[PDB]
């Protein structure tokens, strides 16, 4: 189908034609807002893959995040304590930019449920992700068996708890077995299991 | 309308005017200044007190002077028209 052709075209991201398209798009995005509502996704194939449907109640927002590593927000770069915890510029956030963009969108628009997001463009200073959101109060959403689940309360602000795909990625849930033994079900849960002192009754 | 409770227009002045005062100064003003002293609603208007006197005691108030007491109540000095006897209206109210 046409999906195969769009998928291969978007796998060829370093070609001349795709570089031209992405440069024009990056200029246009650079001259817009941080969060922009769109009628249709820029990549319909990727959006449909990640959960978007051309139905009433589905929304797409393009969110912009600045690129680069984290700076520790200490006054004048002054830190007190051991020299180990003294770096101000070389530290890195333990959360990826896709998760940051999803969280910014979800915190800005609290009446929507964030479902997924995908990379569309990046330039020397910015990075753009399209975030799929669902309206929980729409009859089309509330009567569809395949998106019904997002209306429940356990899914409120899932992007803030890191339950989206990018959240799982930076939590390490992409791995199983010996690669994620201390990270499952979460690192806090594993720490609790491993560090709680157990007092059996008769011992 | 999102407010559905039944509110009666004929009982509004009973809330505006609560009870009269029978202190020495209040009774002193009745005889000479044609003035009745009342305790009224603390959020009430002088115009609303003037209307409430007409609706309740069928008298015309030419002047109303209100003060909020140091204990939080509101006290109104209502001077009746010269056509009305403040002593007669006080007798009708039930204070003497």
């Amino acid at each position: 189908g046409a999906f195969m052709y769009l998928n291969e075209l978007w796998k060829k991201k370093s070609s001349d034609v795709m570089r031209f398209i992405q440069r024009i798009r990056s200029w246009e995005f650079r001259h817009q807002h941080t969060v922009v509502r769109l009628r249709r996704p820029t990549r319909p194939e990727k959006a449909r893959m990640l959960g978007y449907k051309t139905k009433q109640g589905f929304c797409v927002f393009r969110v912009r995040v600045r690129r680069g590593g984290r700076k520790r927000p200490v006054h004048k770069g002054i830190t007190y304590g051991k020299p180990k915890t003294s770096g101000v510029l070389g530290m890195k956030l333990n959360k990826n930019n896709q998760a940051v963009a999803e969280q910014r969108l979800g915190k800005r628009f609290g009446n929507l449920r964030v479902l997924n997001s995908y990379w569309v463009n990046m330039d020397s200073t910015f990075k753009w992700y399209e975030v799929i959101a669902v309206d929980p109060m729409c009859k089309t959403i509330r009567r569809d068996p395949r998106i019904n689940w997002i209306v429940n309360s356990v899914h409120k602000h899932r992007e803030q708890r890191g339950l989206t795909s990018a959240g799982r990625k930076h939590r390490g849930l992409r791995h199983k077995g010996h690669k994620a033994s201390k990270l499952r079900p979460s690192y806090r849960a594993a720490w609790r299991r491993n560090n709680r002192i157990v007092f059996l009754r008769k011992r | 309308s999102n407010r559905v409770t039944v509110e009666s227009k004929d009982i509004a002045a009973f809330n505006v005017i609560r009870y009269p005062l029978t202190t020495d100064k209040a009774m002193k003003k009745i005889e000479e200044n044609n003035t009745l002293t009342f305790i009224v609603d603390s959020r009430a208007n002088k115009t609303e007190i003037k209307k409430a006197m007409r609706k309740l005691y069928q008298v015309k108030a030419v002047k109303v002077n209100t003060l909020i007491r140091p204990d939080g109540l509101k006290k109104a000095y209502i001077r009746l028209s010269a056509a009305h006897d403040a002593l007669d209206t006080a007798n009708k109210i039930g204070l003497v």
Binding site: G1, A2, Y5, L6, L9, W10, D16, V17, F20, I21, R23, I24, W27, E28, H31, Q32, T42, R43, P44 | -
Partner: protein, 211 residues
Amino acid sequence: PTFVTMQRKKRVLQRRLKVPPALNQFTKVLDRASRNEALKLIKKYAPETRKARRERLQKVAEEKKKDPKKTVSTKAPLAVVTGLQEVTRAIEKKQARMVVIANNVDPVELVLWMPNLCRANKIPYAIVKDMARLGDAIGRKTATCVALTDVNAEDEATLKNLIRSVNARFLSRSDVIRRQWGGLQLSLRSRAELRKKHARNAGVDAAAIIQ
């Protein structure tokens, strides 16, 4: 307004930059006369409306209830193939006699590959001016592409002439299309400045030639 400024500057940038052939091929659209003729044919073979389809299905149901033994075909009357998935399937199966692709689809990657697929499968294809005009032809708001798979005997000659005129522009010029780069177009003020500069320096170096 910012959106006005950006929509004008986007066109300016697209003209000023160097456009690779894959994107530049959509600038060289079919001519006006053949575009009007193709839209006339597409509108003649437009898909049936919701009401028309519903009445046809109701009549089919009545013909079924008249006697269950007789089987009535529920196939729709012959029409154009409309929709990205259906047109792609028609091209891939080589069922399409002639494909029409709008040049102003954004995202362009929906139809950027379609001329190459049509060329590879040897199906005649034309690039036309508006998905809005295609949608007006087919009864919708817009249309990325439309495929003519078959026509009636009355329209066979029109389809053949359209195929020839379309192949004149698109299928027979494949070598030029695959290699022609676009863009690099100067502004009017820049062209005027260059012309005046050349006029000023027209004969400064006349005394350096021996003759």
